[PDB]
């Protein structure tokens, strides 16, 4: 198993037991009905375009679940991540074309679930399309949720994708509304969700500082009351602190002009175990 191997050094470079050539795509084309596309995207060599991967999957007529569609759009999303900033539109057109193929084919059995919509929202977050991710895909996922409950339920991954879209698009209030919708749905959020919420509160605090230097809520003294309580949500459920949590908390406290909380957080990072992450020294 490529994720949980029972041997060290899976591959080798010997003369007769050489197995790197047998790890490429095509040896796993023999069994595509039993295949896992997540490990196929992660562990394979010489993979084609994800549009051609979807063409080969639908050509073999295999019943793709939501995990397969999520893995193919995750492959397209990793292609969006690796490209330059000025070349993101064509890969997003490939993503929307693959999504259309996943919608309208209907034989072999292919269903679009919440993970596929979350991957499309993450694709629009990587491309930087607010009007395409929030207005089209998030609204379509919410319509599919409110139309057919008990089989299409929004998990934490979809709202993490929404918070990533609100951070990459700069939209502050929508991310706080999605975190409040996470809270009101009685499910715990991830740590990265609170990191994105602290980043959005930092953006709001910096905008309020620029607006008061130039001359929803125009009272800044309550905003820290809404900010530092996001730090209180880490000790609320379980939510262990990581490096990006310390980064977002120090950025939020620097946006709120409170250096004592930054000097407290830099000591709290050395308390249990946090690598101190030189941008933390910048803040």
């Amino acid at each position: 198993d490529p994720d949980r191997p029972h041997i060290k050094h899976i591959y080798n470079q010997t003369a007769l037991a050489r197995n790197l050539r047998y790890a490429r795509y095509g040896y796993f084309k023999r069994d595509m009905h039993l295949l896992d596309v997540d490990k196929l995207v992660r562990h394979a060599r010489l993979l084609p375009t994800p549009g051609r991967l979807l063409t080969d999957f639908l050509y073999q007529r295999v019943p793709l679940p939501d995990k397969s569609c999520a893995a193919l759009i995750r492959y397209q999303r990793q292609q969006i991540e690796m490209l330059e900033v000025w070349g993101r539109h064509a890969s997003f057109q490939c993503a929307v074309e693959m999504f259309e193929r996943m919608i309208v084919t209907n034989i072999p059995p292919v269903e679009v679930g919440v993970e596929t919509h979350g991957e499309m929202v993450l694709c629009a977050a990587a491309c930087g399309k607010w009007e395409e991710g929030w207005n089209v895909y998030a609204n379509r996922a919410r319509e599919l949720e409110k139309e057919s409950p008990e089989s299409f339920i929004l998990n934490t991954f979809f709202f993490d994708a929404l918070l990533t879209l609100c951070v990459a698009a700069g939209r502050v209030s929508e991310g706080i509304d999605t975190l409040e919708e996470v809270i009101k749905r009685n499910l715990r959020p991830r740590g990265t969700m609170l990191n994105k919420a602290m980043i959005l509160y930092s953006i709001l605090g910096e905008q309020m500082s620029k607006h008061e230097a130039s001359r929803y809520l125009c009272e800044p003294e309550e905003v820290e009351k809404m900010g530092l309580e996001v730090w209180s949500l880490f000790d609320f459920y379980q939510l262990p602190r990581t490096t990006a949590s310390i980064e977002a908390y120090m950025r939020m406290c620097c946006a709120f002009n409170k250096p004592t909380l930054v000097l407290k957080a830099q000591g709290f990072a050395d308390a249990s175990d946090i690598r101190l992450s030189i941008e933390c020294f910048h803040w």
Binding site: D31, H33, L34, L35, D36
Partner: peptide, 26 residues
């Protein structure tokens, strides 16, 4: 997680053919 039993059947069938190589011709 559901397609591991058929993969196990293919692997044990391949091991059975490797043991069939002991028979030689026919």
């Amino acid at each position: 997680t559901e397609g591991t039993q058929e993969k196990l059947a293919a692997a044990i069938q391949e091991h059975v053919q490797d043991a069939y190589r002991f028979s030689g011709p026919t």
